[PDB]
Amino acid sequence: SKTVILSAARTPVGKFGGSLKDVKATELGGIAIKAALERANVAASDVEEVIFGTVIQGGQGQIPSRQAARAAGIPWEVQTETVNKVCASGLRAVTLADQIIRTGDQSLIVAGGMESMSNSPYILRGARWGYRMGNNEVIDLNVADGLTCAFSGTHMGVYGGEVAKEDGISREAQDEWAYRSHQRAVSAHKEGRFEEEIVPVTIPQRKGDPIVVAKDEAPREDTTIEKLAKLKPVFDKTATVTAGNAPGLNDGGAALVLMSEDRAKQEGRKPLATILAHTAIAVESKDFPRTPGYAINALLEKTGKTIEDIDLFEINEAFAAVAIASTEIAGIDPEKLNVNGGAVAMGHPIGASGARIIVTLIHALKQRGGGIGIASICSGGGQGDAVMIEVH
Amino acid sequence: SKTVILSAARTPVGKFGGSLKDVKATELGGIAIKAALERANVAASDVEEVIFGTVIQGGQGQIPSRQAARAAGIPWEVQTETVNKVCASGLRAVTLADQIIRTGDQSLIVAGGMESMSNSPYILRGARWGYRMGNNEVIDLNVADGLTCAFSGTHMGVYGGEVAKEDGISREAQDEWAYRSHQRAVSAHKEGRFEEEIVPVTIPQRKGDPIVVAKDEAPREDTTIEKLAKLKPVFDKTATVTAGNAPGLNDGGAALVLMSEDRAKQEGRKPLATILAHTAIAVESKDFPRTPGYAINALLEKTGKTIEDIDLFEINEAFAAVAIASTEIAGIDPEKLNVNGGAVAMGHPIGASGARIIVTLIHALKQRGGGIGIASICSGGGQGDAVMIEVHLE
Amino acid sequence: SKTVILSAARTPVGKFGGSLKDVKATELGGIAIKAALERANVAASDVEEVIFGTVIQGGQGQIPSRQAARAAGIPWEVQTETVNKVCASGLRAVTLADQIIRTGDQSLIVAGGMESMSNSPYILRGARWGYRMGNNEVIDLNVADGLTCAFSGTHMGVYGGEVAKEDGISREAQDEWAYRSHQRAVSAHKEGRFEEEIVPVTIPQRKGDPIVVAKDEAPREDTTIEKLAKLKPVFDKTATVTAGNAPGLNDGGAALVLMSEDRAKQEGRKPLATILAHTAIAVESKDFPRTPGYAINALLEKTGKTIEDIDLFEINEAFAAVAIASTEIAGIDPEKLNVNGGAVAMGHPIGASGARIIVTLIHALKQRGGGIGIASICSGGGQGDAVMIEVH
Amino acid sequence: SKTVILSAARTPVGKFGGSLKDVKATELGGIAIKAALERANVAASDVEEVIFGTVIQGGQGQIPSRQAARAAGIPWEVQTETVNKVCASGLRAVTLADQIIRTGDQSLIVAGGMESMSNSPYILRGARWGYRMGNNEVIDLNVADGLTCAFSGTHMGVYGGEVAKEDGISREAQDEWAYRSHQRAVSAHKEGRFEEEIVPVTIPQRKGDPIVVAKDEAPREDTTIEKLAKLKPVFDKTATVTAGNAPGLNDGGAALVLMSEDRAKQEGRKPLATILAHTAIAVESKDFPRTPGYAINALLEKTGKTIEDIDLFEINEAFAAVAIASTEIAGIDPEKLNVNGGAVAMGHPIGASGARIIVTLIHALKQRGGGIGIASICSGGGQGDAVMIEVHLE
């Protein structure tokens, strides 16, 4: 009952309708999974279970995790489940893998997440039994299943703005975090700090030569405080949340290979990282933006560690407001937060983001010579999940 | 040691466009969960995790398990995830609850599943970035995400007929198993053997009093071998699979309350059942109908145990052909299989069926004076899952 | 330059999603056309032109008039146009035929109208070039092309209520007209006064025996002033227009055979009726309910006839309010108006109604021993058309 | 006696999804109508009737002719009807105006047509009363109402290739006529021969200054026989019809002002042109491409006249194959046919094309010093319409 991470791989994150528009979510997951197995030196046929997150499942076909496992070359004989915990899906896949391995039921699991918000369909409610008369709506499945509360219909972006308002986080503080997120992502890319974690995506072409996507699409070298201050409130004209200080709709895949500490020892494998612990909390839907600091505090209490014991943090930038608020709630030095950039700059491919931030955290830790990291992520519907990892 | 089941409840199963047409999947889940908590005498605010299965998630809204949890009165502070393992979703929700409780991370979980195949939407692929010109498809999401192979586009019912053909199971054997399934379900309803497991669904009317649905809609009192032999093959003129020896599209929910052995003893709680063990196997998509007997064989191998120690079996009737094939492959006595009816009579609300068969198995064990049971279910994509349970009275 | 009517035939009028739900508009038009040719004793091959009205053309296929001509057994060699003047379509087809015959360019035209509001599709605007993101609408083509003003988006039923309000026509007066319209339609049917004009519709069956529709579906023997007074305002909670005092959405076909007076004389044909004259007026969209009395007054001025010279009137019951208002504006004895019932009782299959009221007027005239009739009809967009016919 | 044309105006023709993408059909109609009234020096409030053609009416809203009339500034008090005779709609609008004026019922009519094939919607058949289960079609309304036979479902382009095959018109003859069509259209634009007939379209931008579209978008300066020979057949691997020797889907409007001879003389108005005569014929749907030459022959027979008395012809290029076939059938000198280009180069906005070719014919006659012309157009469903006009200067 201890879980090691042998490997951690992610695709670049694409913009909505951008570089990965013609790649299915399951293909992005397959690419991440295959790169993780290569980097782990694990044969596909030795995988015992695949646990894969994706949120907008409508129209992906039967059990998307199986499609991603098969796209990776994992044989038919390996069992799989698809999991949905909205933004936490990719992280919960990993913490579920940790739990299953700690029972001894399995010793080698692939876990991660995938999303192609570019390829989400539109739906027709009412067409099955008939509209009869009067106009009806054609519903963006990203909006219906990902971006709006199932209880109130309110957009996540309205809840983000309401929390920023109640927490007293200014427009100017949010635009400063957005700027810093862009500058750290462009810097990390230029200086080669994403080279190790990224598996490029090759897109067969109508033309002759294949398109290679090797870089995160959304970071802007040319964004500035001045340009961000010009943008308009997107969800409410009185709020502070804009397109510039909120993450986009995005496409991406992320995968990790997990193994029992005991099996890795016996096989003579040097793990990339160890899972020390994880916890989740839940609050009302409208308070989802508050959860990452609560989840971090809950995990510190669980482990008996203090904030000063943590070398780096990845808090998913659900909004810039959420990185700032969660910094206050947990008393985090922002110099140790999202040091290679975060979702405001890099995007939020919902089902992948939870696994993506672990992949980024591991490599950020390796880059500063190892240490202890927490990845924390809030999720629509009002949950927060956090995991503590060690890179030796 | 062994995870305990305090309670197990299911809705009636409705026909497609039938008696539960106007009830959302998440409401069916909530009703089942609330009845499970009432029967367990567990407070909703003491639940630590809800793990709920559903397959056609398209258009249900954010994290359907959470909607089901809230519909049951479970507070905001309880964590939840939705799981999808096609037909196995409701069963894998339970075996995941078992693994989590066995780690010690939690001691009280609600697990189960739900589906409203009636309320699944249609989709438009291509409308987001534009058709430009030419006709396109408006796609039935039950067909796209539930009933067709992600790899080949082939209907599960084609795979059902192909496996029945290859195993040499006749049209006549399939129709006899279908007639038997209806006789056993009708018989279980009329003799009061479903009364304990079913939580009725109350549908508030715009008009007069509420409608209360208390009975499984699909079982037919008046079906016969004669009528079944008249039906035409549905997926291939040359195959043996009809609307009468294949389950329907259906609406339902089912829920169980799971607790650690240790916590159950501290609180004075007698288990309804114990989870002994579970396993899963996986094969090619086209071979999904063969998995239940293989899942049983691997589960027996794992527990050192013998087919003769098992008092009752629930094998989800993915087709009549699957109950027959699995009987030979596991060497099962048919008199010990699906004794109150199965999916051919009762229906297959995909996300719920894996929890549903465990609820039916627990109550069939209890009616028999107790014993050991295996629930086994195959799922689209080529998986089989089986769980071994123990039921004792007093 | 005079036009005779050799024959006049209509299908029964079906309710929305009712008796004619599985018959295409072009099939309803074909059935009417074929019955008119039989009743005229005119060979299909001698027809020189088919002019046919239909309003909701979306999804009917290429030139619906040609489909109706071919469904009637009219050979490929006969020319055809489809015309759209909303509610006036079926009447304008007839008055256009009169004009063409008065030039001598042709001497034998089939004219009429057809509508299947049951079979109108739904549309997606935005799907061609792509929604990109956000919910959109699926639009009822009856609502978009038939029932709402192209300028304001307002429902015809809102304009009906606004005119009833401005003209001081009470809820109670409208419910009395609705009751009278139902009682005259049921009476006409029971006493055989629709037997001559109706051509039954035969619907081939999944079962063995074909369904024969021989009766107008919408008239209610059991409707009463009491039941009508219980109904709620449908378009605005402060207005007087209800489901009971406004016509429905309906399905129907109507056809007439027109011939030059000179050719009919030479062939020894006794015409059913003669077209004496016609006129149209136009007003702003919102004033469409006012046009029938104006059109009648314009036609009396044109012919130098007075209201007392007219034996019977058919004013299409666009609303009960419109029969009442148009009665005042033209000073019409209501005992000579819509004597066998009208659209409030019988339905308003938009593209057919203009031809339908002429078919009804001719037979109502024959039943009282001949005389002079005016048919008048308002049409969405703010037009009114009226025709004066003689039955000798 | 003879109806007179005071004026004739057309928009540029836009490509599908091209330069007029953001302009509704009714706006294109209004722009053409307003330019016709300006050029006729006729007051909008003196018009007595608007007869306007459009084919894909689905989703345009109530009586599109009235929307076009109001877009032109024509008052509410002017009567209007929309007509549909597929590709002949714009031309039959004019010949109907001619018949009405010849009765004396009216003395001043606006006639013409419009289409925005760019803005045609998709439809859902079956969503009103419900799919129940199974995939359905989302239908391109251009395809359903414009481009396919109501009787067979066959694309007009299949009928085009079948008639080209049966008439023995080679791929090479079709591509030479296509190259010629582009050369003549490009040439007419560059040499200022379209400047008089075209009314530019001004598209107000959300952003900076308005976009002014003044040029036909489809004519290609850089097309060659070589490039045309490289294209693959569109509707049948074995046919000769390509994207290059068939017209596109296009956006456009065109309008004419018609007046009685008597009224024109009272008001001092010199006619742009006189309508001499018109006729229409009808054949089987599949034979629609053969009708233009037959319509010309019947119109000559009717007027006692001879093919040699006609100075210019506009035969709508429904396909290159149709211009060639019709040339043989009517015995036309190609040097007198479509002399400023036709639909293969210029496009086919179905509802407008029949008015458009009359506008182009009037200005080609005027450029030639005057004369007699015939416009002939075939239409989906199997019709042909031809109109004879006279143009004199001074």
Ligand SMILES: CC(C)(COP(=O)(O)OP(=O)(O)OC[C@H]1O[C@@H](n2cnc3c(N)ncnc32)[C@H](O)[C@@H]1OP(=O)(O)O)[C@@H](O)C(=O)NCCC(=O)NCCS
């Ligand atoms: C906020 C949101 C509505 C924006 O959608 P969008 O309008 O498509 O966003 P875009 O990036 O296309 O548009 C924003 C505009 O601001 C500009 N902009 C955005 N970020 C900028 C930056 N950092 N610097 C400068 N300009 C910027 C863009 O260039 C664009 O302007 P343009 O139209 O001239 O190109 C969408 O990304 C969203 O809903 N995000 C939240 C996702 C979420 O909540 N996920 C979790 C769900 S549980």
Ligand SMILES: CC(C)(COP(=O)(O)OP(=O)(O)OC[C@H]1O[C@@H](n2cnc3c(N)ncnc32)[C@H](O)[C@@H]1OP(=O)(O)O)[C@@H](O)C(=O)NCCC(=O)NCCS
């Ligand atoms: C088989 C299937 C296509 C049938 O759909 P359907 O046509 O809507 O089925 P119905 O329930 O309407 O039955 C069709 C006919 O058979 C008849 N029939 C069905 N079962 C019968 C029985 N036991 N006795 C007599 N008649 C019976 C019905 O009465 C009906 O007759 P009717 O149309 O005259 O009323 C559909 O249920 C299916 O695809 N099921 C497979 C489920 C599955 O594979 N799920 C797992 C995938 S991962």
Ligand SMILES: CC(C)(COP(=O)(O)OP(=O)(O)OC[C@H]1O[C@@H](n2cnc3c(N)ncnc32)[C@H](O)[C@@H]1OP(=O)(O)O)[C@@H](O)C(=O)NCCC(=O)NCCS
């Ligand atoms: C008014 C309108 C919205 C009604 O649509 P609808 O709701 O489908 O109408 P229905 O007849 O189904 O419903 C009306 C209700 O009143 C009742 N009702 C209607 N007429 C009645 C009568 N004469 N006596 C008693 N009850 C009557 C019906 O039974 C029904 O009640 P129910 O739901 O219990 O069956 C629709 O017919 C309409 O828009 N009409 C105007 C058409 C028009 O303007 N055409 C010209 C366009 S240019």
Ligand SMILES: CC(C)(COP(=O)(O)OP(=O)(O)OC[C@H]1O[C@@H](n2cnc3c(N)ncnc32)[C@H](O)[C@@H]1OP(=O)(O)O)[C@@H](O)C(=O)NCCC(=O)NCCS
């Ligand atoms: C023929 C038809 C299917 C073509 O549609 P499409 O594929 O959208 O056509 P495009 O304009 O995109 O042309 C296709 C290709 O041919 C090329 N092409 C077309 N005309 C060309 C020319 N003159 N020279 C060189 N290349 C040419 C285009 O550049 C394009 O190449 P690309 O795809 O690499 O850019 C369509 O226009 C049609 O159905 N037309 C018939 C109209 C009709 O029948 N109307 C009357 C019915 S009642």
